[PDB]
């Protein structure tokens, strides 16, 4: 196989928004998307962004202090989805942000949807024009764990994934 | 957040870094490499998009040709340099250049032709509202709160000696030495290999960098130390490899830093770098030589090896005539001192008065940068 | 016969060899492998005597664990090494060590700890009257009658680049590459298998060695050659298998040597070895670079593939800036040149004055080997 | 050949030279450096014979300490000086001192203690039949056929200003400036490096010397010239490196000579050398000042840069009060004028009457040299 | 290897003669040795001077105008020999003389004699106490060519190796 899907312009539009931040005032800094969920719409002809499911950085201040947990909750092994998440982590000087694509490809997910997803990773990153780092898990425990996110970092120079878990 | 946080971009041969004002150190550090097709690309389907900047390119070194945008503190190829600035703002910092003004660092005695042109690119290519050019050696002396003295700067890619009196660098006291930080990493791997460890590919070169900050040590006395090393005992020191094996380093703990001090191990007939600092002092005015000894500052990249401060005192004492006091200035934040000096004085309010703006460049032109400094 | 014929032992990763002085080549060549129980020995009655050195062990590879006494030109395990020396004198050479002094070869930039200890074993373990340590690259340049130049050495087990000026090797111009002779043999079998021939057991690995000297060829131009190969015609070349079948090799005739030149076929992102030689020259002093081109020597293990000399000229010309002469030194006895250089200067009479003796070691100790060379 | 050809030894800070009478220039020119162990000799087997004089030592600079027998026109260490004379006759000239008498040059206002002793060494250490001491500035004015005037002498190692009236130098009109020829070569390399070319080792320092005679130019007007340079166009000029690359020099063509004229580029607060010549004239008697302008002579080492004559006229005109004629004396053989003046008047026949002989020294002693001159 | 031969006093004796010239009158200036051939006598225990083969400067005036050609003729690749030759060349002012040791080490020469010679270069120059410049060729064309002698000089400031060839 090679590249299951060709692109519907939707992913690029939302990705572009994340890349420039699309923010100035305090009002929209908190409306910036820490994480976004991507999936392929029915017939799987096109790849798009899911309106219903997304994670905002403003949430940590607004009401939820663990964005990387909500993501775990809204990503059942029951459904296979594509996602972009901002690392937003501290390494003993200050904190930056690594763009990471999160692949959720649970083996146990319904075969019909999951199989196209699995085969489409080359096609999905094909439009990603090579992505920096990636995290992939097929189960809740790997997605849930702090260490998997920290593995990317290196793990010997990171005391605080979110300023508290490590 | 909002007024003009000041984006600082620090450039050198390698291991470049950037951040925001009010910080105690830079937020992100990345490799300086650019890659395009080499050896016809390595087979099956060549043409694609290739111009990789960052550490993603490091893996891709075998299939992409790497060109250095910066060669030992200066920029020869601008096309590679532009990619780095694009990538730093949009991909590494992840902050819009438009809200925050950018400060660019420079090597001491930077050529005049380059200085006018770099300013030119910021104003038209990236439309940046404000920018400033600073010298890494000047800031490090400045950071200690002392304006009179001599600074030996360990850059992330190049080491320069720049004695500074009243903000002015001495043209007749500055020399360029090419061994600083990235080069040592290559060297450390090279001696590690000699003992009996396998390094044959550029991919695992990066791994020794981790080794460098954790395991590089400087001995109080090199020859006495060598005799101790043969018996082994407690000399061997543990280290973590991603796979699980631990590579034990015993007499290599002190020998690696020694290459700067004793180039002969490399195969160089050249004088040691500490000695090189001494030559600059000899050339300098005799009356201020005693002051210079008490004004010495150690900053940057690889000066953070433990025991280095102890070694410096010994060699300088042997090199110096005698009968006088030698004092070394040691700032806690010496690794980030170069970046730190630039970060703090970029947003106070009275630094607003002093900024070189885009609007000014349009009027006077390239000539403006020479005119407002001092 | 009688005065001190000089026993020369040549050590490397594999395919070690030895002989007597006055000879034009070594008398015997054997594999470097040592075996002890693996996988509990393979069933029914385990304990026995196992430590096999030589090619008898090769058959026994499945039931014995093989450890390499020499890893890429250096010795990590001395216990395996001792068995090789015992076996070489008593079983391979079939000459008493006591009458004849032994000369041991070394890899370039051999670690200091090993150098004192090897000398130590000869004097007490085997009670040898005289011994000497030599460098394979030095002798090969020396053999051509030229002291100034750069030698690319194809070892029987490891390939080292060692530019030599006045008997002194350049530490800053030497690099270690792990593909030389035994590794190619593994590789040749690997590509042979791809076409459609069955190789699944280590027992028949040795068979391709015969194939290597008889059938390895180098093409004048690789890509043009590939097009010619598809039609077949006269490209297919006959070879003898012990059983009777002949395995025909057509486009594999030139492709095998190409792996050294073009590592990409293997799956390596690393630069070609000929290119690697070029990097050493770039690092070298500019004034002597023209002399180096006229001083190049090809010697050892697998350089004896026909057409290799023709290929080298082409790549060097493309790699080099231009406007200058490139000359390659080709000694008829290049395969045995490494051993040959050591054999002749070991018994003249004035080489008696220069020998390191057992009696001297007892007095000064391990320190003596460092002191009398140059 | 036979009567007494006269061996002339010309001494200075560096780039010393020698020859025979009747010649139009000296036969051989060599570096003035002496080397003995530095940094413990660089490893493995130290003690040997080391005291190298000539350019063979230049390569050996990294492993040998260099001491200057001559510091800016005078001799402080006699042990180094003797080696130079031994090497010059026996190895450089390849002529026996015994058949041919030797003439030694001296710096203006040479100290009295040195003058008696140098004579002493020739008579007893080398048993030379005849010798004479001459002044480089005197001969250059003398060569033009003019005895009244002021000579600016560009020495191979040191530049001295020596106005001469009737064979007598003016003690109150002579000043010592340390920038002459070898120092410029160091400087040329230093600015070349700034543009973007790699110079980090003393071995390639010699290479720029070739660059100096072929590529050093002087501009008619420096500031106007700088503006022309930025556009490039035809300013860039080709040069040959031993390896094959050509280092292009554009605005560096005129800027290098400028350092003598404008010390500020170096980092010196000192007045330009041409100005320094002017101070000597100001101190001089007013009546003869007009004569001095018409009596100016340019000779030696680096005065042979083209365009230098044109530049001198401009600066002197600006420095001078006005209303009068300024004339510069330009001898075709100005580079060799210092040596040439000494060579011709050493063998006529009536110069036999005037020679200071070995036999005379034995009688009167050291006192004799002061007594017979004038 | 290190130094194949120890010295027989013969080389030093002849070398010493060249160093001082051993000449005064017109009669012996022409008998001075422009070039001398050195070889190691049988058993190769000792290094000496060959009585049969040598080149005199007087030859250029006496009858042969190209000493550096006769040397080429009397140095077959067939025999491997050691030699000293005086440069005697003009560089655009006048002419001097560089002492150069000429190493003739042809690869193609009989292996038995040649091999000791090759191995003995460190030993032969060991008694030379470091020699200024050297020329080495393993074939007639390199020895024959004017340019190789000129290479030592520099080659950009030499119009006449012998006053005519360049």
Curated annotation (Swiss-Prot), chains B, C, D:
It comes from the Eukaryota. The modification N-acetylaspartate is found at residue 1. The modification Tele-methylhistidine is found at residue 72. Keywords: Acetylation, ATP-binding, Cytoplasm, Cytoskeleton, Hydrolase, Methylation, Nucleotide-binding, Nucleus, Oxidation. Oxidation of Met-43 and Met-46 by MICALs (MICAL1, MICAL2 or MICAL3) to form methionine sulfoxide promotes actin filament depolymerization. MICAL1 and MICAL2 produce the (R)-S-oxide form. The (R)-S-oxide form is reverted by MSRB1 and MSRB2, which promote actin repolymerization. PROSITE patterns: ACTINS_1, ACTINS_2, ACTINS_ACT_LIKE. The keyword Hydrolase applies. It is found in: Cytoplasm, Cytoskeleton; Nucleus. It catalyses: ATP + H2O = ADP + phosphate + H(+). GO terms for biological process: axonogenesis; cell motility. Its EC number is 3.6.4.-. It holds the Pfam family Actin. PANTHER family: ACTIN. Belongs to the actin family. Actin is a highly conserved protein that polymerizes to produce filaments that form cross-linked networks in the cytoplasm of cells. Actin exists in both monomeric (G-actin) and polymeric (F-actin) forms, both forms playing key functions, such as cell motility and contraction. In addition to their role in the cytoplasmic cytoskeleton, G- and F-actin also localize in the nucleus, and regulate gene transcription and motility and repair of damaged DNA. Polymerization of globular actin (G-actin) leads to a structural filament (F-actin) in the form of a two-stranded helix. Each actin can bind to 4 others. This is Actin, cytoplasmic 1. The lineage of its organism: Eukaryota, Metazoa, Chordata, Craniata, Vertebrata. The gene is ACTB.
């Amino acid at each position: 196989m090679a590249s299951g899907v060709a692109v519907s312009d939707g992913v690029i539009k939302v990705f572009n928004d994340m890349k420039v931040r699309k923010s100035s005032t305090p009002e929209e800094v908190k409306k910036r998307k820490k994480a976004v969920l991507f999936c392929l719409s029915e017939d799987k002809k096109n790849i798009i962004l899911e309106e219903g499911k997304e994670i905002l950085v403003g949430d940590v201040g607004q009401t939820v202090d663990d964005p990387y947990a909500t993501f775990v909750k809204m990503l059942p092994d029951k459904d296979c989805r594509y996602a972009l998440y901002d690392a937003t982590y501290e390494t003993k000087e200050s904190k930056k942000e690594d763009l990471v694509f999160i692949f959720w490809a649970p083996e146990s997910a319904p075969l019909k949807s999951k199989m196209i997803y699995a085969s489409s990773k080359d096609a999905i990153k094909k439009k990603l024009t090579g992505i920096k780092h990636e995290l992939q898990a097929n189960c809740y425990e790997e997605v849930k764990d702090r260490c998997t996110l920290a593995e990317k970092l290196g793990g010997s120079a990171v005391i605080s994934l979110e300023g508290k878990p490590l | 957040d909002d007024d003009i946080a000041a984006l600082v971009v620090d450039n050198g041969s390698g291991m470049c870094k950037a951040g925001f004002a009010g910080d105690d150190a830079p937020r992100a550090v990345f490799p300086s490499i650019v890659g395009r097709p080499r050896h016809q690309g390595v087979m099956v389907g060549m043409g694609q998009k290739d111009s990789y900047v960052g550490d993603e390119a490091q893996s891709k070194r075998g299939i992409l040709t790497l060109k250095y945008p910066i060669e030992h503190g200066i920029v020869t190829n601008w096309d590679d340099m532009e990619k780095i600035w694009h990538h730093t703002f949009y991909n590494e910092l992840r902050v819009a250049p438009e809200e925050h003004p950018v400060l660019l660092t420079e090597a001491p005695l930077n050529p005049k032709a380059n200085r006018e042109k770099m300013t030119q690119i910021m104003f038209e290519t990236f439309n940046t509202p404000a920018m400033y050019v600073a010298i890494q050696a000047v800031l490090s002396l400045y950071a200690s709160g002392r304006t009179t003295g001599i600074v030996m700067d360990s850059g992330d890619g190049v080491t320069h000696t720049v004695p500074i009196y009243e903000g002015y660098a001495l043209p007749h006291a500055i020399l360029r030495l090419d061994l600083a930080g990235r080069d040592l990493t290559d060297y450390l791997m090279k001696i590690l290999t000699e003992r009996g460890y396998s390094f044959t590919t550029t991919a695992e070169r990066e791994i020794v960098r981790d080794i460098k900050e954790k395991l590089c040590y400087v001995a109080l006395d090199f020859e006495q130390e060598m005799a101790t090393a043969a018996s082994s005992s407690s000399l061997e020191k543990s280290y973590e490899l991603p796979d699980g094996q631990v590579i034990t380093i015993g007499n290599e703990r002190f020998r690696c830093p020694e290459a700067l001090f004793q180039p002969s191990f490399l195969g160089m007939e050249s004088c040691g770098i500490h000695e090189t600092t001494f030559n600059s002092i000899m050339k300098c005015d005799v009356d201020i030589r005693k002051d210079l000894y008490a004004n010495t500052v150690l900053s940057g990249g690889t000066t953070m090896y433990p025991g280095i401060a102890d070694r410096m005192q010994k060699e300088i004492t042997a090199l110096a005539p005698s009968t006088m006091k030698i004092k070394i200035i040691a700032p806690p934040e010496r690794k980030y001192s170069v970046w730190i000096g630039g970060s703090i004085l970029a947003s106070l309010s009275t630094f607003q008065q002093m900024w070189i703006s885009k609007q000014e460049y349009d009027e006077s032109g390239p000539s403006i940068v020479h005119r407002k400094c001092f």
